[PDB]
Amino acid sequence: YTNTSIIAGGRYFELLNETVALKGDSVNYIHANIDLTQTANPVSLSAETANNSNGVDINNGSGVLKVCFDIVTTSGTGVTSTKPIVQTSTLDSISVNDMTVSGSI
């Protein structure tokens, strides 16, 4: 990740030329792991077998927050396709003028 900024659990961090190892001929689920107890380096990355997002409330309580952001599909040699995780925007009421939809409502 040459230059990728991520806001996980309201915590901002930048990935500057951070390389993560992958599994051959597998669908790798890249996770952003936040552990507040690890005061020196709280954010760590991991390529996993499945989407192991926990949703741990790190701001109010304790624990390690895991959240998938990228899905890397690989072959025997390298990477075949990359699909990023959807960015959910939970809202109560919208007062908008115009809208353009690429999928469906």
Binding site: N17, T19, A21, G24, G76, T77, G78
Partner: protein, 298 residues
């Protein structure tokens, strides 16, 4: 003058730690056997002798581990350190040095003893036994050779000189010999004179996405094996180790280390054993090689 024994945690590597078992605080003394046992498979029929194949067998070296320490605390700290350091790495390379040679042996810890028969200021006198992985090999630097153009001589070289419009004479023996070749700087030979068994090459690639690595040719100019990699971006260098025990095929870009094994061409890499001939550089700008070649008795 006198011989030198040196235990190495990891030779050919950045994380090396050396213990002098000849001059240091912990010393090796009176090696059990440095020679060799051979089994020739000889069968005799009616007084006539027939010989099979010789299996050169290497025997366990048993040393006399001896620590020299100012206090009981010091010698206990020496035994805990030296042994764990041998245990920490899967195998340890013992260096044998004398006035004439500098051989190496790959060893594995077979047996170490700890007893309560302490000398003065609590000094150990124990037996350390090692298992032979590879006995006696030469770790040396392998470099390419350059070819230079021969000097131009009037009457001897092919030139149209002297009186116009030039002249070159056919003589007997002296006649005309070509000076050299235009752009002789293209010719380079990585000469292999004896059979080598493993190597630690530092390859610097040229173009990305174009297979980069090394290829080996025999005495007749035929390829027998090739370590080549097709990476997406230009690696700063590809660090390759052909050693069987800790095989490494990793690419480096900046401070990041990448495993290049799955990107490698598996068809071309037929053998590890390099034969008499030459080596070529595929898509490489620079290369640094360290060759290790075996010797049964030294």
């Amino acid at each position: 003058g006198v011989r030198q024994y040196k235990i190495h945690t990891n030779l050919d590597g950045t994380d090396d730690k050396v213990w002098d078992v000849t001059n240091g605080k912990v010393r090796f003394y009176q090696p059990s056997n440095l020679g060799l046992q051979s089994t020739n498979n000889i069968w005799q029929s009616n007084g006539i002798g027939v010989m099979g194949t010789r299996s050169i067998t290497q025997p366990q070296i048993e040393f006399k581990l001896e620590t020299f320490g100012e206090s009981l605390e010091e010698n206990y700290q020496l035994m805990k350190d030296f042994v764990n350091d041998i245990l920490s790495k899967k195998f340890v390379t013992l260096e044998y040095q004398t006035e004439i040679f500098q051989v190496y042996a790959d060893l594995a810890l077979a047996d170490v003893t700890k007893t309560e028969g302490y000398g003065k200021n609590g000094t150990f006198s124990e037996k350390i036994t090692f298992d032979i992985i590879t006995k006696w090999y030469t770790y040396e630097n392998l470099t390419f050779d350059k070819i230079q153009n021969g000097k131009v001589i009037a009457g001897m070289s092919k030139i149209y000189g002297g009186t116009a419009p030039g002249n070159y004479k056919y003589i007997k023996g002296t006649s005309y010999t070509y000076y050299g070749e235009s752009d002789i700087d293209r010719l380079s030979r990585w000469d292999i004179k004896e059979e080598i068994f493993s190597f630690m090459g530092i390859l610097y690639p040229k173009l990305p996405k174009t297979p980069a690595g090394v290829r080996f040719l025999d005495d007749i100019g035929n390829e027998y094996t090739a370590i080549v990699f097709k990476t997406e971006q230009v690696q700063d260098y590809i660090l390759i180790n052909t050693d069987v025990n800790d095989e490494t095929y990793q690419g480096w870009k900046g401070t990041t280390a990448l495993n290049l094994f799955p990107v490698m061409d598996f068809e071309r890499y037929r053998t590890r054993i390099i034969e008499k001939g030459q080596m070529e550089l595929i898509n490489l700008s620079k290369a640094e090689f360290k060759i290790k070649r075996k010797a049964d008795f030294v």
